[PDB]
Amino acid sequence: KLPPRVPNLIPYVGSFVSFAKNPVQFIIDNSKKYGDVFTATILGKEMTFLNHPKILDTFFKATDNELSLRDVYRFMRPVFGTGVVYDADSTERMMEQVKFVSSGLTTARFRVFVDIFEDEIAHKVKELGPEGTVDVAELMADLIIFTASRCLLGDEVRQYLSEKNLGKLYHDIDDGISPLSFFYPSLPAPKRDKARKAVGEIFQELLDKRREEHKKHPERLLDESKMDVVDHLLTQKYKDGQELTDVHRIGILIAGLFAGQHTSSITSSWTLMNVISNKKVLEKVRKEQEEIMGSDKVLDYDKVMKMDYLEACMKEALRMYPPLIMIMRMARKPRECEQYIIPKGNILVVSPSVAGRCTDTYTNPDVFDPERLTERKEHEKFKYGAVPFGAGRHKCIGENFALLQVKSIISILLRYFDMEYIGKIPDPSYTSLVVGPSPPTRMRYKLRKQ
Ligand code: HEM
Ligand SMILES: OC(Cn1cncn1)(Cn1cncn1)c1ccc(F)cc1F
């Protein structure tokens, strides 16, 4: 047969409400009811949910003629741009773009990023003062609105991030992208579109400056450690010889910068928060920190490689708060899963949010406990037991940059500060397309060298 169905409140609207209440809880409740698979009409979309690691093989290895991304995240267009990534001409033109960014994220560059991380957290401590309080959130995003910019675009950008308000414009973009937009791609959003244009120009500009810097400084091109994304773009040609257009450029910089900022700064928040609020942890971390930093007064890519425990904390925050709670693919052929046959036109959904709290994989899964990963190995149980980065053909290609970018920021931060958190770990907030713990998230901080 077809999968069971969430019986609807109404035709059309279907189950939008209890889904929208808590997207994840929804999927969990109904799993227990109707089993490993089940369909639910949500604002007129046929969304089948796959709900047990065992079965997620097919979802991830199917091809983009079988299971389309482009179909489903196409709505991102007004953000990224036209003919870009999910709105790109093809499966293969997307990939080719993806890789352009992922070339800005090489071992050579990573070494330079760690220096950038410092340079900025320095500039940042100034703004704070020896002690006070601050929304962790606001800070991660604010650190990360600066680091990434430089990491991918290069220090050239910083004069804009500073003088020209670029952060704010990012928010106008990034606060005009409801997850509703998925069900209504044409929901009018003028103030975003003004921002995305203003950005557009600047990103253009940027290239226009960067071109003259190649004429005046060609040697840059041979040196792997200044070859940022912008360059890779300015000096590459799709695999068939077709040139890239500045609008493909300007739009792929943003495609990245989007990928870069939010998911990370949210894991920066969720992780720290659980560390400075479990003393057995904040311990082990500072042991590792101090073992490693030794006589050194600043960070390096090798140090950060060795920050194993801390990574388990960030892994753990992802099992507790994966900021992409839902991975989606439209079906174009009909699909055989288990005994069922999911029909063409449906949308297939898989949740990390869920998979991280399944109970065969994880004991006391409401308990933040890096030892579940490092000693108990709970994530190795099933081959898709934990998937914060996705997997198969579309596995995140920022994984290592991410890990690098946070681990670095949290380390560097601890060093500077003794910090403690105020009241409980807030719950997730399901208001945005990237899911982060809910405001306010304040913490006391005071320094460590007079
Ligand atoms: C907490 C940090 C992050 C998490 C949890 C995360 C998660 C994911 C997940 C779950 C997917 C799979 C989407 C799918 O299969 O449908 C993905 C794909 C992707 N990610 Fe990330 N990511 C993170 C950071 C980054 C960063 C920092 C960048 C770039 C700077 C990035 C760039 C991308 C790109 C380009 C893909 C495309 C894969 C494809 O071609 O479909 N990610 N990520
Ligand atoms: O996959 C995302 C967008 N997305 C997927 N579901 C909901 N939003 C996020 N992402 C994952 N890692 C980093 N960002 C992405 C993929 C590529 C990209 F260029 C932007 C972008 F948001």
Side-chain angles (χ1 to χ4, degrees), residues 204-208 210-215 217-223 225 227-241 243-296 298-334:
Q204 185 54 59
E205 188 148 328
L206 229 69
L207 297 161
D208 285 332
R210 183 62 63 79
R211 284 187 175 98
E212 87 215 322
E213 276 276 52
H214 292 152
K215 276 168 170 167
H217 283 276
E219 68 296 74
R220 181 179 182 114
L221 297 193
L222 289 72
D223 180 25
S225 70
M227 221 104 73
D228 69 42
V229 179
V230 169
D231 310 283
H232 292 311
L233 290 190
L234 271 181
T235 57
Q236 283 290 349
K237 284 135 214 120
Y238 297 101
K239 266 189 189 154
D240 56 38
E243 199 79 316
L244 274 65
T245 55
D246 271 27
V247 171
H248 291 167
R249 295 187 173 87
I250 290 165
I252 290 162
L253 298 196
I254 296 162
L257 282 178
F258 195 90
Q261 299 194 29
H262 307 282
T263 41
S264 291
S265 91
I266 279 170
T267 317
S268 265
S269 304
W270 279 114
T271 310
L272 199 77
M273 295 216 215
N274 277 244
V275 165
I276 72 186
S277 309
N278 188 340
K279 181 186 161 180
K280 300 181 156 199
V281 171
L282 176 45
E283 269 178 24
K284 277 144 145 290
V285 164
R286 288 179 172 286
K287 178 204 177 187
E288 169 170 83
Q289 287 313 299
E290 290 163 343
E291 289 183 84
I292 284 162
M293 280 292 282
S295 51
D296 310 281
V298 304
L299 217 62
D300 80 35
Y301 170 92
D302 270 310
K303 277 166 183 62
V304 184
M305 278 276 280
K306 293 190 183 111
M307 299 192 188
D308 295 40
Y309 197 67
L310 180 44
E311 190 174 325
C313 293
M314 191 157 151
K315 289 301 149 93
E316 184 63 18
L318 300 172
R319 190 207 53 95
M320 296 197 64
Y321 312 104
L324 300 172
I325 61 171
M326 263 168 60
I327 299 180
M328 303 177 277
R329 305 268 187 276
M330 179 163 309
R332 282 182 164 191
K333 289 201 196 162

Side-chain angles (χ1 to χ4, degrees), residues 322-364:
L324 300 172
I325 61 171
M326 263 168 60
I327 299 180
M328 303 177 277
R329 305 268 187 276
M330 179 163 309
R332 282 182 164 191
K333 289 201 196 162
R335 307 260 78 217
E336 324 205 304
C337 205
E338 266 189 356
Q339 61 245 38
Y340 304 97
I341 44 167
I342 311 154
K344 165 183 185 187
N346 270 51
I347 303 202
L348 274 55
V349 191
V350 166
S351 188
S353 290
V354 168
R357 317 244 177 157
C358 166
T359 23
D360 328 324
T361 324
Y362 302 111
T363 50
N364 282 53

Side-chain angles (χ1 to χ4, degrees), residues 69 98 259-260 263-264 267 323-324 327 329 388-390 394 396-398 401:
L69 279 69
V98 160
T263 41
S264 291
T267 317
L324 300 172
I327 299 180
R329 305 268 187 276
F389 289 103
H394 293 314
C396 193
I397 60 109
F401 174 59

Side-chain angles (χ1 to χ4, degrees), residues 73 76 80 85-86 255-256 258-260 263 324 326 396 433:
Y73 299 91
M76 305 247 208
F80 297 178
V85 181
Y86 298 115
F258 195 90
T263 41
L324 300 172
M326 263 168 60
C396 193
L433 190 59

